[PDB]
Amino acid sequence: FPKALGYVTGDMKELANQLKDKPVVLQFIDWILRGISQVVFVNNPVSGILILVGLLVQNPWWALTGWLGTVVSTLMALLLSQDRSLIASGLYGYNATLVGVLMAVFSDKGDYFWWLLLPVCAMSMTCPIFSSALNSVLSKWDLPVFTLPFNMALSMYLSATGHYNPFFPAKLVIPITTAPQISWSDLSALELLKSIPVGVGQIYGCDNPWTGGIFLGAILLSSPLMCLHAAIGSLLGIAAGLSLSAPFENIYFGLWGFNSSLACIAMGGMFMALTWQTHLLALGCALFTAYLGVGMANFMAEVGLPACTWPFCLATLLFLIMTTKNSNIYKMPLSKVTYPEENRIFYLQAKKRMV
Amino acid sequence: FPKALGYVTGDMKELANQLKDKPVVLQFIDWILRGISQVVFVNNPVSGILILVGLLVQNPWWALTGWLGTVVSTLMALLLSQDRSLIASGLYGYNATLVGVLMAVFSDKGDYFWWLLLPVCAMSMTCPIFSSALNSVLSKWDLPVFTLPFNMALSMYLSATGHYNPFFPAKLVIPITTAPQISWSDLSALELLKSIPVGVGQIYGCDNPWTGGIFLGAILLSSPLMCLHAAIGSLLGIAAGLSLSAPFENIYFGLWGFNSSLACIAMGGMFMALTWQTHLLALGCALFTAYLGVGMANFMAEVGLPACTWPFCLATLLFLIMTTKNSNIYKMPLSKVTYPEENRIFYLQAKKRMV
Amino acid sequence: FPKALGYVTGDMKELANQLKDKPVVLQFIDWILRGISQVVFVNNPVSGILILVGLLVQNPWWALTGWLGTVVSTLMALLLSQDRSLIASGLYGYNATLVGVLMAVFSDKGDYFWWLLLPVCAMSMTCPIFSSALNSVLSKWDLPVFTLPFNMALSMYLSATGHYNPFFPAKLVIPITTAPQISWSDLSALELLKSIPVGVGQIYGCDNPWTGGIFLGAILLSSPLMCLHAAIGSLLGIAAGLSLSAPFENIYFGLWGFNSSLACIAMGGMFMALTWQTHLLALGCALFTAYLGVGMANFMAEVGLPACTWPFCLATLLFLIMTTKNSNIYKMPLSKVTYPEENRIFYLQAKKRMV
Ligand SMILES: CC(C)CCC[C@@H](C)[C@H]1CC[C@H]2[C@@H]3CC=C4C[C@@H](OC(=O)CCC(=O)O)CC[C@]4(C)[C@H]3CC[C@]12C
Ligand SMILES: CC(C)CCC[C@@H](C)[C@H]1CC[C@H]2[C@@H]3CC=C4C[C@@H](OC(=O)CCC(=O)O)CC[C@]4(C)[C@H]3CC[C@]12C
Ligand SMILES: CC(C)CCC[C@@H](C)[C@H]1CC[C@H]2[C@@H]3CC=C4C[C@@H](OC(=O)CCC(=O)O)CC[C@]4(C)[C@H]3CC[C@]12C
Ligand SMILES: CCc1ccc(S(=O)(=O)c2nnn3c2nc(NCc2cccs2)c2sccc23)cc1
Ligand SMILES: CCc1ccc(S(=O)(=O)c2nnn3c2nc(NCc2cccs2)c2sccc23)cc1
Ligand SMILES: CCc1ccc(S(=O)(=O)c2nnn3c2nc(NCc2cccs2)c2sccc23)cc1
Ligand SMILES: CCc1ccc(S(=O)(=O)c2nnn3c2nc(NCc2cccs2)c2sccc23)cc1
Ligand SMILES: CCc1ccc(S(=O)(=O)c2nnn3c2nc(NCc2cccs2)c2sccc23)cc1
Ligand SMILES: CCc1ccc(S(=O)(=O)c2nnn3c2nc(NCc2cccs2)c2sccc23)cc1
Asked: Which residue in chain A has the smallest CA separation from C164?
C-alpha cells in the first residue's frame, strides 16, 4: 500500500515518464486530468479524477462543460504549437476548465442548455492564446500567469452576452443599493464551519460542501501543505467577511473564501518557499485577497460583471512582485516550482549553498 | 500608365525622397496626407487624398475636424522634437485624425459647431505625447502602438465632457437594459452585403457605404492584400454579430466590422508575415476582435463611454504577444514593416537565410 | 538667523546625519515627519510639522488618522525589511498618511468615529506592500511610484465598504445626470483667487484656505520653486475647470487644482530638470492633469468611486515616459532627485559634462 501511495502523490512523475513512452491518446487523457487538477495548482491526474468526481457530485452539466473546455483548450494548444512540456503538465487546460464550468454556472438557461457548448468551445479556444500572450509578458519577470486567461476570457464573454442576449443570456449581476440587515444572533457556528470546504469548492464555482470536501481530498492527495493552506485561506476569507459585516448567506455560500483559498495556496509554500515567515505572509495575502475580493465584486457589479478570481490573481501578483531584504522570505524560481514539500527541500539546499 | 501606377502604389518611396529634397511646406502636406492614410496602416499620400475625399463624401465637417487634428498633431510632434522619420511617415498624425473625426461624430451639438475646434486642437496636442509615451513602452518589446493614443485621448475627452457638459456635450451612450426583439425573417442579404464596406468606413466613424468603398479603394491602391483583409475582417465581424443575435441595425451600420477589419489588416500580412497559417490566424483574430468589440462596447456603455477601437488594439496586441513554435507563423520586425507584399518578400528571404 | 534658515531648508541633510547617530526613537519621529511631508514631494521634517499643523487647523480627527497611518506604515515597512534609506526619507509613510486622512474624509460616520482606526491601520499595512511592489515594477524603467499605492489602497477600501456597509459606510459618490446651471455673473474673483491655496490644501483633502496656505508655507520652506509650481498648477486647474464650465462650487472647493498642483510640482523641476522648456511642459502637464482629473472623476463616479489622485499619477507617468530629442527637456535620474534647486545644479553640471 505505501508504494501505491507514494506513486499517486505529489506530481506523479513516474507515471508522467511511463506515459511519455505510451501512445498519445493516453498522454492526452493524462494532460486533460492534469489540466483539471491544475486549477488548484495541483499537477496530478488522480487529483484531477477526484476533482472531476466532485464536479459530478455538484452538477454533471458543469462537469461536462468544464471537461469539454479542458479538451478543446489542450487541442487548441497542440494546434498552436505551444510548449509540449507546458501542455503535458496541464498548464494549457485549467483556464478553460474554469471557463467551461463558469460559463454554465453564470448561465441563465439552466442545466443541459446544449447550445452553450458552442460558446464554451469558442472561449476554450481563446484560453491558449491568452495563456500564451500573458505567459510571455509575465515570464519576462518570472511571474506566474495564475487564472488571468480564464478571467479575461470570462469577462469578455459575460460582457459580450450579458443578461439580455437572445441566444446565451447570463445571470444578472446586481449592485447593492441598500444596506443589508444582518442579525448577528442568527449567525450559525455550524454553517461557518461548513463554509470552509464550501470556499474550496467555490474555487470551481461549486456550492456543495461535499464537492469542497472532495476537492480538499484531492489537494491533500497531492500535497498536505496545499490542503492546509487551502482550508486556512477559506477560513481567513470567512473572517474577513465577518469583519466587513457581510450577509451571512454570502459567507455560507463560500463566496468569501475561494479567492483567499487560492491566494493562501499560492503564497503558502507554492510560489514562495515555505518558512514560518512566508506562512504568515500567506495568511496576510489571504486576508488582503478576501478584502480585495469584496472590493472587486462591488466594483465590477457596477459594470454587470462578476469579480471571479481577479482578486486572487491581482493580490498574489502584488505579493510576489513585492521585495524584502528578509532572506527567509524567498520567492521560488518558476522553473523549480513543483509542490510545497519539494519546494522547501529545494529552498533549504539553496540556502545551504548561500551560506 | 503602368509607370504612374507603380509610382502611386505601395508607400510611394520615390516621392518621399523627391520631397525630402523639396521645401518643408510640401513635405508637411505629404506628412499630413500620410497621417490621414495611416489610420488603415497605409503610408501613402494619394491614399490619404482618397480617404479625405471619402470623408468629405460622408460629412465635410468631419473631414475638417479630422484634417485639423492631423495638422495640429504633426505640428505638435515637430515642436516636441520627435523622430522626423516617424513624423514623415505620418505616424504622428493618424491618432489625431481619428480624434478630430470622432470628436465631431460623438458630439451633441451638430455639424459645424465651430467651438468644437477648440477641444479638437487641445486633444490633438495630447496625441503626440500619448504616441510618444506608449511608443516607448511598447517598443521595448517590439510592439506596435496601434490606435491606443487615440483611444486614451478620446476616452479622456468623452469622460471629461460627457452628455451634460454645458459647453461641449457628447452623445449619450446608453447601456442595454432589455432584450432586443430580432425578426430573423426581416434580415436582408443586400444590407448584409452592404455592411462590408460600411465597416471599413466605420474605421473612421463613417456610415456611408460610398465612403467605405472609397476607403477600400485607397487601401487597394496601397496594397491589394490589405484591401482583401479589410473586407474579410468586416465580413467576419458581420458573422460574429449574427452569431450573437445582435440587432440588425447595428450590423448594417458597420459597428460590428470596423474593429475586426483593422485586426484582420494588422494580422493578415502587415505585422505578421503573410503565410496561409497567418491568414487563418488573422481570420481568428478578426472573429476574436468582433467578440471583444461587443464585450467592450457593453462594458464601457456602463461607464457612459464608447468602446471605439480599444478592442482592435487589445486583441491585436494579444495576438502579437502570443508565441508559437510554428516557423511559418512569423512576427515581422517593426523596422521592416512596410506593406504585406514587401513584408512577404522580406520574410521569404529571411526564411531562406534561416535554412 | 540665516544659519538656522539654511539648516531647516531643503531636505535637512545635516539633521538626517545627526539623527543617524541618535537613538532610533528620534529617528522614527524624523521618518514620520518626512513621510508626512513627502505627500508634496518634500523630504523635510519641519515641513512635515507645518503640514501637521495645517491638518490640525483643518480637522484634528483627520490629523490623527493620517498620523496613525504614517506610523503604522513606517512600522510595517520596518517589519517587512524594506530599504532603510527609503524608510528614512519618508518614502514608506506618505501613501498611508494619505490613506489615513482620506479614509476619514470619505467616511460617512462623522468625526472621531473611533472604529475607523481599525480599517485605517489595516489599509496602512497594505501601503508598504503596494509601495514595494510598484517600486519594483516602476524602478525597472526609472519611474517614480507617485501616490499609486495610496490610490490602489483607497480604491480597494472604498469599493470593499461602499456607502451601504453596516460597519464603515463611505460617502455616496453620485454621477452627474443633469446639466448644471452655471450663472457666470455670479462668478467671484475673490473666490477664484482663494481657490489657489484651497487646491494645494486639497492635495491632502483639506478645504480650508488657511490649511492650504500653511501647506504652501511648508513647501516654500523646502523649496521656493516647488511652492511656485504648486500655486501655478492649482491656478491652471482653476483655468481648466472654467474652460469646461464646471460648477463654481467645485472650483472653489479646490477639487480642480490638487491633481494639477501635484503634476506641476512633479514636472516643474522635481523629476525633470528645471529649464524654461520643462517649465512650459509642466504647465502643459498641469492642464492635461486637470482635464484628466475631471475625466476620471466622471468615469469613476459611475462605479461609485472618487478619482482621488489617479489623474496626477497617470498623467505624470505619461509625461515622464514621453521622450523628446530636445536636450533641454531632461528627465532627472531617480537617484539624484532631491529638490528643484539641487536638481538644476546637477543638470547644469551634467550638461557641461555632455559638451
Ligand atoms: C489584512 C490586510 C488588510 C493587511 C495584510 C497585512 C499582512 C500582509 C501582514 C500582517 C502581519 C504581517 C507579518 C507579521 C510578522 C512577520 C514576521 C517577520 O519576521 C521577522 O522580521 C523576524 C526576523 C526574521 O525573520 O529574520 C517577517 C514578516 C512577517 C511574516 C509579516 C508579513 C506580512 C504580514 C502577514
Ligand atoms: C472565434 C474566437 C472566439 C476564437 C478564435 C480562434 C482562432 C484564433 C483559431 C481558430 C482556428 C485556428 C487556426 C486553425 C488551423 C491552423 C493551421 C495550423 O497549421 C499547422 O499546424 C500545420 C503545420 C504547419 O503549419 O507547419 C497553424 C494554426 C492555425 C492557423 C490556427 C490559428 C488560430 C485559429 C485561427
Ligand atoms: C491642455 C492639454 C489638453 C494639452 C497640453 C499640451 C502641452 C503638453 C503643450 C502645450 C504647449 C507646449 C510647449 C510649447 C513650447 C515649447 C518650447 C519648445 O522649445 C523649443 O523647441 C525651442 C528650442 C529648444 O528648446 O532647443 C519645447 C517644447 C515646449 C516646452 C512645449 C511642451 C509641451 C506643451 C506644454
Ligand atoms: C501558457 C501555459 C502556462 C500556464 C500557467 C503558467 S503559471 O505561470 O501560472 C505557472 N507556472 N508554474 N505553475 C504555474 N501555474 C500553476 N498552477 C496553475 C494555477 C495558477 C493559478 C491558479 S491555478 C502551477 S502548479 C505547479 C507549477 C505551476 C505558465 C504557463
Ligand atoms: C468576496 C465576496 C464575493 C466574491 C466574488 C463574487 S463573484 O462576483 O465572483 C460571484 N458572483 N456570483 N457568484 C460569484 N462567484 C461564484 N463562484 C466563485 C467563482 C469561482 C471562480 C470564478 S467565480 C458564484 S457560484 C454562483 C454564483 C456566484 C461575489 C462575492
Ligand atoms: C509615436 C509614433 C508612432 C506611431 C505608431 C507606431 S506603431 O508601433 O503603431 C507602428 N509601427 N510601424 N507602423 C505602425 N503603425 C502603422 N499604422 C498605424 C496604425 C496602427 C493601428 C491602426 S493604424 C504602420 S503602417 C506601416 C508601418 C506601421 C509607432 C510610433
Ligand atoms: C461590436 C458592436 C459595437 C462596437 C463598437 C461600438 S462604439 O462604442 O465604438 C460606438 N457607439 N456608437 N458608435 C460607435 N462607434 C462608431 N463608429 C466606429 C468608430 C470608429 C473609431 C472609433 S468609434 C459610431 S459612428 C456613430 C455612432 C457610433 C458600438 C457597437
Ligand atoms: C517603496 C518606497 C518608495 C516610494 C516612492 C518612490 S518614488 O519613485 O515615487 C520617488 N522616488 N524619489 N522620490 C519619490 N517620491 C517622492 N515624493 C513622494 C510623492 C510622489 C508623488 C506624490 S508625493 C520624492 S520627493 C524626493 C524624491 C522623491 C519610490 C519608492
Ligand atoms: C476635477 C474635479 C474633481 C477631481 C477629483 C474629484 S474626487 O473624486 O477625488 C473627490 N470627490 N469628492 N471629493 C474628492 N476629492 C476630495 N479631495 C481631494 C483629494 C485629495 C487626495 C485624494 S482625494 C474631496 S474632499 C471632500 C470631498 C472630496 C472630484 C472632482
From this structure: A179
For chain C, the residues whose C-beta falls within 8 A of a C-beta of chain B are 176-180, 182, 243-245, 288, 291-292, 294-296, 298-299, 302-303, 318-319, 321-326, 329
* Residue B326 to residue C260: CA distance in whole angstroms: 50
Give the closest-approach CA distance of B204 to chain C in angstroms: 23
Which of B182, B244, B329 lies nearest to residue A161, judging by beta carbons?
Answer: B244
Residue for cell digits 452585403?
A: B193
* Chains adjacent to B (≥3 CB pairs closer than 8 angstroms): A, C
Alpha carbons B236 and A232: distance in angstroms, whole number:
48
Residue A229 Cα to ligand 4 middle (Å): 17
Instruction: Provide the 8-state DSSP code for B107.
Output: B
CA distance C25 to A123: 58
What are the CA-CA distances from residue C145 to residues C77, C149, C339 (Å)? 16, 8, 17
- Whether residue C195 has its Cβ less than 6 Å from ligand 8: no
Rounded distance between C-alpha atoms, residue B326 and residue B320, angstroms: 14
Q: Are C337 and C271 in contact (CB under 8 A)?
A: yes
B147 C-beta closer than 6 A to ligand 6: yes
CA of A284 to the centre of ligand 1 (A): 7
CA A135 – CA A87 distance, rounded (Å): 13
Cell digits of residue A186: 442568527
- State the structure-solving technique: cryo-EM
Residue of C nearest to A320 (CA): C133
- With contact defined as beta carbons under 8 Å apart, do B80 and B129 qualify? yes
Establish how many alpha carbons lie within 13 A of residue C128's alpha carbon, considering only the half-sphere containing its beta carbon: 27
Q: Locate cell 468603398: which residue?
A: B213
CA distances from A10 to A222, C151, C316 (A): 4, 41, 49
Q: Is A87 exposed, middle or buried (0-12, 13-18, 19+ CB in 10 A)?
A: buried
Query: Distance of alpha carbon A130 from its chain centroid, rounded?
Result: 16
Reduce the DSSP state of residue A125 to 3 states and report it.
Answer: helix
Ligand (nearest to CA of B31) = 6
| Nearest beta carbon to residue B82 from set C182, C319, C324 | C324
| Secondary structure class of A305 (helix, strand, coil) | coil
User: Is the Cβ pair C164, A177 closer than 8 Å?
Assistant: yes
- The sign one gets for the Cα dihedral B323, B326, B328, B333 is positive
In whole angstroms, give the CA distance from residue A132 to residue A128.
Answer: 6
CATH topology of domain C1-355: Ammonium transporter fold (1.10.3430)
Map residue C161 onto helix, strand or coil.
Answer: helix
How far is Cα A82 from Cα A100, in angstroms, rounded to an integer? 21
Residue A115: exposed, middle, or buried by beta-carbon count in 10 A (0-12, 13-18, 19+)? exposed
Q: Within 13 Å of residue C20, how many CA atoms lie on the same side as its CB?
A: 11
Please, what's the b/e burial string for A126-148 (b: 16 or more CB within 10 A of its CB; e: otherwise)? bbbbbbbbbbeebeeeebbbbbb
| Backbone Cα Rg of chain B | 20
Nearest by Cα to B211 from B334, B1, B62, B3: B62
User: What nine digits make up the cell of B123?
Assistant: 486633444
Task: Specify whether the backbone of B108 is left (phi greater than 0), alpha (psi in -120 to 50) or beta.
Answer: alpha
Residue B8 C-alpha cell reads as 502611386
Residues of C in contact with A295 (CB under 8 A): 155-157, 159-160
Cell 487646491: give the residue: C199
What is the CB < 6 Å shell around ligand 3? B 79-80, 122, 125-126, 129; C 277, 280-281, 283-284, 287-288, 291, 326, 328
Q: Resolution in angstroms for this experimental structure?
A: 2.6
DSSP A306-346: --TTHHHHHHHHHHHH---S-TTS-BPPGGG-S-HHHHHHH
How many CB atoms neighbour CB B89 within 10 A?
20
